[PDB]
Design a binder for this molecule. Structure first.
Ligand SMILES: C=C1/C(=C\C=C2/CCC[C@]3(C)[C@@H]([C@H](C)CCCC(O)c4nccs4)CC[C@@H]23)C[C@@H](O)C[C@@H]1O
Length: 253
């Protein structure tokens, strides 16, 4: 069976697309406002050197902080999100922030050279830039694998925004209060996605796609935990806080 999208489901999709268009600048025109990226010589991938300088951390921390603000804006436009208590809204945002960033970053990621290309050379982010920010391959490898995997799903923009919305409004987040309400909101989004794929996504892929998308949400949970471990190590580095931002300190602290 291929039920058609209800008027409400169409509205939800239009709302999410508009929300994404208002919060994701495909030209990356604000990036020059961030603290400048610095790339020091480290072909050897020296952890000692990387930690002593954390040359790319100020720039990436500003990028991530900027992105969190956008995700907050996006979340506030998700149908139903405002119905949640302020406390639940914050718990969901803090717990999914890094995951949504990884998801939305897929738009700038390119398999041409496996990098996130946001402009000229200065704003082309490679795995080497992540290491220069203090991270290890335990996070980087899975991250790239995840990016390529998501790219291959060839998601329609409609599927992309729904996946981000579903990621945010998850009832199984530590600390949530009204899980039932959150699940109700998420189910409404999941059904919309499931329905969209069935009557709008042409084969090969009319099916199987939903499961693959759900699996990516699971992958995101693992990356979230790995990033958390790495962030902890990073926080031990003296003077690290100055290379971050208040928003970032709260979200990952
Ligand atoms: C943000 C966005 C973009 C790219 C994403 C990237 C490339 C550079 C490195 C990133 C930011 C990965 C890096 C794992 C995160 C590590 C940094 C970090 O622990 C911290 N930082 C502040 C406090 S701790 C995750 C997503 C990757 C560009 C554009 O698509 C907008 C998108 O929101």
């Amino acid at each position: 069976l291929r039920p058609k999208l209800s008027e409400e489901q169409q509205r939800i999709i239009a709302i999410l697309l508009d929300a994404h268009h208002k919060t994701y600048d495909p030209t990356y025109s604000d990036f020059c406002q961030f603290r400048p990226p610095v790339r020091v010589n480290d072909g050897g991938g020296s952890v000692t050197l990387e930690l002593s300088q954390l040359s790319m951390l100020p720039h990436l921390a500003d990028l991530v902080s900027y992105s969190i603000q956008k995700v907050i804006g996006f979340a506030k436009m998700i149908p139903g999100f405002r119905d949640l208590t302020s406390e639940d809204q914050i718990v969901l945002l803090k717990s999914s922030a890094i995951e949504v960033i990884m998801l939305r970053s897929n738009e700038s990621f390119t398999m041409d050279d496996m990098s996130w290309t946001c402009g000229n050379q200065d704003y082309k982010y490679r795995v080497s830039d992540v290491t220069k920010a203090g991270h290890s391959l335990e996070l980087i490898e899975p991250l790239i694998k995840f990016q390529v995997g998501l790219k291959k799903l060839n998601l329609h923009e409609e599927e992309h925004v729904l996946l981000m919305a579903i990621c945010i409004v998850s009832p199984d987040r530590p600390g949530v209060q009204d899980a039932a309400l959150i699940e109700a909101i998420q189910d409404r989004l999941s059904n919309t996605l499931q329905t969209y794929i069935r009557c709008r996504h042409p084969p090969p892929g009319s099916h199987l796609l939903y499961a693959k998308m759900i699996q990516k949400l699971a992958d995101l949970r693992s990356l979230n935990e790995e990033h958390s471990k790495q962030y902890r190590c990073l926080s031990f580095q003296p003077e690290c806080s100055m290379k971050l931002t208040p928003l970032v300190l709260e979200v990952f602290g």
